[PDB]
Amino acid sequence: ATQWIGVNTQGSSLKNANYDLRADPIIPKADVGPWMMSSVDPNIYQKPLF
Amino acid sequence: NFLTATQWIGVNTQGSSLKNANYDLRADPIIPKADVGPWMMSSVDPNIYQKPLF
Amino acid sequence: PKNLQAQNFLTATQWIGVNTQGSSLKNANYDLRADPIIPKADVGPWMM
Amino acid sequence: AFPTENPYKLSGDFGNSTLEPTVTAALRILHESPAPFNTEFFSRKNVDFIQKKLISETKRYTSFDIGPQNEDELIMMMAGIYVQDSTFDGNIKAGLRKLNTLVIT
Amino acid sequence: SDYNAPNDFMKIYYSNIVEDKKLAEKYPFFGTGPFTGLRCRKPNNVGCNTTWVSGQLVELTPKLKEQIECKFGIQYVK
Amino acid sequence: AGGLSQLVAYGAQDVYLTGNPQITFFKTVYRRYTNFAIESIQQTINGS
Amino acid sequence: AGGLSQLVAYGAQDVYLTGNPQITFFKTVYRRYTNFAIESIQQTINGSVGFGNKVSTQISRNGDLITDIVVEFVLTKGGNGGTTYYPAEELLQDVELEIGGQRIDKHYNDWFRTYDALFRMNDDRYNYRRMTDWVNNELVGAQKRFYVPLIFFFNQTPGLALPLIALQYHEVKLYFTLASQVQGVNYNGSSAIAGAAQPTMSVWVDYIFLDTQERTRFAQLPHEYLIEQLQFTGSETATPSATTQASQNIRLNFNHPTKYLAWNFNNPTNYGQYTALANIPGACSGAGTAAATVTTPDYGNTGTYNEQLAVLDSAKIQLNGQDRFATRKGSYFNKVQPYQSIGGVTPAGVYLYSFALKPAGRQPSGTCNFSRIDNATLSLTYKTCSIDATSPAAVLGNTETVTANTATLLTALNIYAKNYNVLRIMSGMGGLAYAN
Amino acid sequence: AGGLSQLVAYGAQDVYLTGNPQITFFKTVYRRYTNFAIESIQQTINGSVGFGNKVSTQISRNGDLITDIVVEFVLTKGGNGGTTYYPAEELLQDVELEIGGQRIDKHYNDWFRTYDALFRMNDDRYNYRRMTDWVNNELVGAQKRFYVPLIFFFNQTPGLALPLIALQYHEVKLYFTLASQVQGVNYNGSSAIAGAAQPTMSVWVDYIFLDTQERTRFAQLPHEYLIEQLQFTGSETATPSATTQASQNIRLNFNHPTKYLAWNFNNPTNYGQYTALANIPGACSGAGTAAATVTTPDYGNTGTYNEQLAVLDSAKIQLNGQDRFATRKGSYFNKVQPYQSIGGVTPAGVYLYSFALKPAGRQPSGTCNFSRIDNATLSLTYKTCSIDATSPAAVLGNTETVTANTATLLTALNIYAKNYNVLRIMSGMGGLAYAN
Amino acid sequence: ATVTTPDYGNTGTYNEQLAVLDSAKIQLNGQDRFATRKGSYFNKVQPY
Amino acid sequence: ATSPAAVLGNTETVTANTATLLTALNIYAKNYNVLRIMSGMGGLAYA
Amino acid sequence: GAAQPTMSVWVDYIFLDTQERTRFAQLPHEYLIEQLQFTGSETATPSA
Incomplete structure (x- = not known):
């Protein structure tokens, strides 16, 4: 499979990154509208440290 | 004999301003006013009364 | 030669540029619109 | 010996399309708005009648089997005869009877 | 501004801008000819007899028909 | 006037061109394709 | 790294470009074509060839389809460098095309100049000039063979080829008007050039021959071609x-x-x-x-x-x-x-x-x-x-x-x-559908 | 002899070429199209046209959809021959396309020069230069009319033409910024040219007029255009x-x-x-x-x-x-x-x-x-x-x-x-699908 | 005689040779309302 | 002149x-335009 | 000899308590702005 080169785990997640030490709350990708669809990811912290 | 109140356009009502006007002579069939998505909505009413002459 | 389903015999060449009857109407559609149909009762010498 | 299906210059000439009906095309060249007389005469059911009537009558007069005729030429003929003679007083059936008679002849 | 308050997100919108929801549900079609600009039921100009007043399109309920008919010379011909 | 004077000047002769149309020019549909990437890679030359 | 890195980088926007693929750019399949062969044949020119003369050719049913036609002239230049400007194009004052005596088209020397001015492009114009002119500063006495391809509806692409099979009763004929005055060849301005030679003219027609089943179909089926x-x-x-x-x-x-x-x-x-x-x-x-x-x-x-x-x-x-x-x-x-x-x-x-x-x-x-x-x-x-x-x-x-x-x-x-226009050929005879 | 001698030369290698024929090259089939007409209409510019000035124009709804747009300039040259270099597109410093208050993109004078330098070739590049520069060794004081075509997603091919009838609620407009310094017209290097005239500008928009049946579909149906x-x-x-x-x-x-x-x-x-x-x-x-x-x-x-x-x-x-x-x-x-x-x-x-x-x-x-x-x-x-x-x-x-x-x-x-990107049009309103 | 000051009591005249306007056209939404007329059309014919 | x-x-x-x-x-x-008069006050109908 | 300016962009950030952060992150909002x-x-x- 073409990811034999390695998984791009960053994806798009840092384009609008969280620079806080507190994790951002999860904001689900709910109905938006036809002219302002985004393509980042929420970049949820995997370890909140709290 | 009062001209303002009719069946057609109704009572005490002006057609308001026209923006994004149809400069063409064609009817430019009306697309119903609706809000499709939360952003970049227009408050311009279509030129409803522009006669289907063709 | 009887199975002539691939043949196409009609040729409407005499019918291009035809007016309502033999008059010179400058066929050209000068009126940029609909031109609705005029009812025609076939009563000749005296219309009614 | 002979092919029974024509590799037309334009295949699927009328029918097999949703962009515009046959009637609208006729109305443009006529420069006329829709009316019951126009919408019946240039209808698919009337064109189908005419195509089948021509195939059956030809086979009755001759010994030859013919298929449907070039529709582009037929619709131009229908509109041409229509303009030259479209006489009715509102009696649509009587007018179509005369007009279809002229197209078939 | 109050903290212990409901989130007033588009509530004014849903009640006072939108698309005349209740009217449109009962009257899905638009006027086709001389009465273009009025909303009603059925194609052409049939399931109608609606009116436009100083603000928005409204249903011409018998109460409104009388309030206007008794004051203005409208014969309300269908 | 303008583009309208040409649209009304429509005749029987146009059925071959615009009658019962099959395509338009102003609403193109592009074909979807198999995803690929192009890369230029150094080869090793064997010899002097 | 490399291209694979690009591929594993995919997202929401991509479905519009690569979802449920319809084509692969790397698997082109070529279509098989009915067999045919092309050859160039010289036609008979009926009439006296010269300046101010009118000649014609009745084109023979040597093949099954006719496409490209090239008229050639051999001229001797009466001037020096810069004295000519498309002398073969000026000479070919006009070409009239008939099928069964019915006029299909007629092109003039000035139209050929306009056609070059508008629709010819991409260094074809230069090669065209090479076919119609002296482009290398040639001097008085130089002889050159010129080619003036004709640009009728069936000349520029095989898809508009004119059936010869389906025209058993109507002949295909071209009429040529040869200019009385050609600059730098027999006149310099309004002055005649003494000793100028009359042109040598030949009309070449490229024929296409079809194989067995295809030429049968061409004899049997009616034909409708889109005409310029x-x-x-x-x-x-x-x-x-x-x-x-x-x-x-x-x-x-x-x-x-x-x-x-x-x-x-x-x-x-x-x-x-x-x-x-x-x-x-x-x-x-x-x-x-x-x-x-x-x-x-x-x-x-x-x-x-x-x-x-x-x-x-x-x-x-x-x-x-x-x-x-x-x-x-x-x-x-x-x-x-x-x-x-x-x-x-x-x-x-x-x-x-x-x-x-x-x-x-x-x-x-x-x-x-x-x-x-x-x-x-x-x-x-x-x-x-x-x-x-x-x-x-x-x-x-x-x-x-x-x-x-x-x-x-x-x-x-x-x-x-x-x-x-539309050229309809049925039962051995051709003609235009629209004649206004 | 002739073409027939080639048709008979049928071998094993031909089953991949002429066997079970699929196409014939001598039968053009062209696809039938909706009736339309093309018109170029002048737009009204809002603002004062000049060097370093910003102006804008809202595109009128005179037709159903838009294809090319040409910006026309009238300039007077302030220098001798060879002192200008594509002044028409350097003057056209910024062009910004806005549909309904949302930017689509914008082009820079340097971008027009790069696109031209990169994608136009041969006869096309030269005719472009003719429209944007002085190419025949012309002198100081000469007046020339210049035409700078715009190259947005809908300008070079009708397939992506922008549908105005599908945009009854959004205004489509262009913003222009004109350069303050234009080499050979207003400035010679860094030095101002005394007496230089201000430019005159006009914006022409190519309108397409449709038939009623196609117009109805465009107005009522949603659209997705795949655009650059x-x-x-x-x-x-x-x-x-x-x-x-x-x-x-x-x-x-x-x-x-x-x-x-x-x-x-x-x-x-x-x-x-x-x-x-x-x-x-x-x-x-x-x-x-x-x-x-x-x-x-x-x-x-x-x-x-x-x-x-x-x-x-x-x-x-x-x-x-x-x-x-x-x-x-x-x-x-x-x-x-x-x-x-x-x-x-x-x-x-x-x-x-x-x-x-x-x-x-x-x-x-x-x-x-x-x-x-x-x-x-x-x-x-x-x-x-x-x-x-x-x-x-x-x-x-x-x-x-x-x-x-x-x-x-x-x-x-x-x-x-x-x-x-994807241009989405729904209920008379436009805008782009993705924005990041 | 001067031509900088009128004979004020006779200011109104009928000779269009002294008029400014050669021709006029009205356009509505970019379309002509009627084909161009000379100035005398508007002074003599429309009021007729 | x-x-x-x-x-x-x-x-x-x-x-x-x-x-x-x-x-x-x-x-x-x-x-x-139209002059509307109601309750002692008049004014234009269309602005 | 004039020197180029040196820029620094400073942004005042608010750090909210946790409960209000949830309200802001998940509830939809409208702002009436200039x-x-x-x-x-x-x-x-x-x-x-």
Whole structure:
């Protein structure tokens, strides 16, 4: 499979990154509208440290 | 004999301003006013009364 | 030669540029619109 | 010996399309708005009648089997005869009877 | 501004801008000819007899028909 | 006037061109394709 | 790394480009074609060949289909370098095409010059010039073989090939008018060149032969081909010398659906001169030195690109007494319209207005039908011919509304229309479907 | 003998060519189309047209959809022949397309020059230059009408024409910024030209008029157009005169499936200069004689094909720290990628790397989607700028790793990303699907 | 006689040779309302 | 303008050199509107 | 000899308590805000 080169785990997640030490709350990708669809990811912290 | 109140356009009502006007002579069939998505909505009413002459 | 389903015999060449009857109407559609149909009762010498 | 299906210059000439009906095309060249007389005469059911009537009558007069005729030429003929003679007083059936008679002849 | 308050997100919108929801549900079609600009039921100009007043399109309920008919010379011909 | 004077000047002769149309020019549909990437890679030359 | 890195980088936007793939660019499958062979055959020219003579050829049913036709001439040049300008194109004054005596088309030498000016492009024009001219500074006495491909509907692509099989009763014939005057070959300006030779002429037809089952189908089936035709008649115009920018309303006598209207203004005595002459390079014999005379061109450089020496200021077309577009300046029709429609470069003095999105293509793309237009008018405005043509300081240093005093010689007006028809062939006979 | 002798030469190898025929080349089939008419209509400009001024125009709804748009300028030249270089598009400094209050994209004068320099070829590039510059050695004081076609997603092909009837609630408008300094018209280098006239401008929009049946569908049905847009942010470079080859890593900020990245290096003090100036023919003002000065170009000849004067030595594109391909020399991006991707000639100083097979077209053919790349970097290596620009013996007599000392002035880096988006139109309102 | 000061009591005249306007046209939404007329049309015929 | 020979005997499209003084352009329109009077107060119907 | 300016952009961030952060992150919001519309024009300042 073409990811034999390695998984791009960053994806798009840092384009609008969280620079806080507190994790951002999860904001689900709910109905938006036809002219302002985004393509980042929420970049949820995997370890909140709290 | 009062001209303002009719069946057609109704009572005490002006057609308001026209923006994004149809400069063409064609009817430019009306697309119903609706809000499709939360952003970049227009408050311009279509030129409803522009006669289907063709 | 009887199975002539691939043949196409009609040729409407005499019918291009035809007016309502033999008059010179400058066929050209000068009126940029609909031109609705005029009812025609076939009563000749005296219309009614 | 002979092919029974024509590799037309334009295949699927009328029918097999949703962009515009046959009637609208006729109305443009006529420069006329829709009316019951126009919408019946240039209808698919009337064109189908005419195509089948021509195939059956030809086979009755001759010994030859013919298929449907070039529709582009037929619709131009229908509109041409229509303009030259479209006489009715509102009696649509009587007018179509005369007009279809002229197209078939 | 109050903290212990409901989130007033588009509530004014849903009640006072939108698309005349209740009217449109009962009257899905638009006027086709001389009465273009009025909303009603059925194609052409049939399931109608609606009116436009100083603000928005409204249903011409018998109460409104009388309030206007008794004051203005409208014969309300269908 | 303008583009309208040409649209009304429509005749029987146009059925071959615009009658019962099959395509338009102003609403193109592009074909979807198999995803690929192009890369230029150094080869090793064997010899002097 | 590399391309694989690009691939594993995918997302929401991508579905619009690669979801549920329909084509793969790396698996082209070629279609199998009915067999055929191509050969070139020389036709008989009936009539005396020469300057001012008219000859014709009745084209033989040597093959099954006819496509490309090339007329060749062998000429000896009567002048030196720069004295000729498409001498084979001028000589071929016109070509008339008949099938069964029915006129299908007719092209003129000036149309060939306009066609080169508008629709030929991509170094084909240079090779074309090589076929029609002396392009290497050749001297008096040089002999050269010239080729003037014909540009009828069945000449430019096999898909419009004219069936020979299906025409058992109608002959295909071409008529050729050979110019009485060809610059640098038998005349230099208006003066005859003593000893000039008469041309050697030959008409070559390329035939296509079909295999067994295909040629059978061609004999059995009717044929409908999309036809390109030229509509033309010449007229006179009025170019003013001073104080005014003259207008002229020219009636457009056309009766078909068209791709475009194209026109030029020329000096009737100098084949291809569509601009004023001036004492600047390429626009005058002797340009740049005291011998310069702005009444005679440096013929070989006749085609130039500076619209300053062009006579047209603005043009509008009216259809049924209605403006078709707001009046545009001549530069629009010389440069802008052919840019967006053809993608070529048009020399100064030649203009086109299209009705089609792709007037250079075989695929129809929008037409104006002059069978339902009554008084169509081309309204032309000329710029004032006040610049002294002999003074470069003025020739290249003035306003948009004036041109040289020598533009008044461009008295011949040529308006062309490029239209549609359909050639129907059934039961051994051919003819046009539309004859208006 | 003849063609028949070839048809009989049927062998085993032909079952892949002429066996079980699928197509015949002698039967053109063209597809039938909706009736439409083309009209060019003048727009009203809101604001004062002039040097350094900003104006805007709202596009009227006179037709159903928009294809090309041509900006027309009228200029008076303030210098002698050779003092201008595409002044029409340098004046047209910024064009911004806005649909319903949302920006689509914007084009820069440098982008028009790059697009022209990169994608237009032969007859097309020349006719473009004719529309935007003075190309026939014209003199000071001459007046010329210029036409600058716009190149938005809907301007070169009708397939993506913008549907006005589908946009009854949104206004479509263009913003224009005009340059304050235009070489040879308002300024000569940094010096103002006294008496220079202000430009006159008009914006022409190509309107398409449809038939009623197609108009109804367009108005009522939702649409998705697959369109291209330009993304751009400028930057700066540095290259030393001697000791080292400069390296530079510029971080890119692009967001969509991208067809290609094109870039150039320029001297902002002039217009169109993408190479060093040198005392060789056409490479500086006065080149070849004692008056030659390598600080000022021979402006009308600014564009060159001599990459020796170009500053870039080599480059690679890196995505997330992983090289997308191994390092290439500047001449590779100038000569090979446009050879494979476009098929024309790219002048020196203009560089391209394509991700698409044929980015010159509009049918998608391979894209790099930068919305999924965390850090995209263009890594540059510059040539050593040690060659004395004034000595032809050293300028034309040197190696790959060195260029002229005047190359150090090409301090601006302009990277243009042409990429895909989706234009969604629903209930008379427009805008783009993705925005990041 | 002067031509800088009128004979004020006779200011109103009928000779269009002293008029400013050569021709006029009215356009509505970019379309002509009628074809161009000379100034005398508007002074003599429309009021007729 | 001072020579009757040139003023009263000239062409269709040429006027007096003194016409250049008529620099003020005055364009009038007469339109319809409606005066509504209710409860002692009047005003325009259309704005 | 004039020096180039050196820029620094400082942004005042608010750190909210946790409960309010949830309200902001997941609930939808409207703000009634100002914006500026601007185009340039030319004056007609007279002389004497």
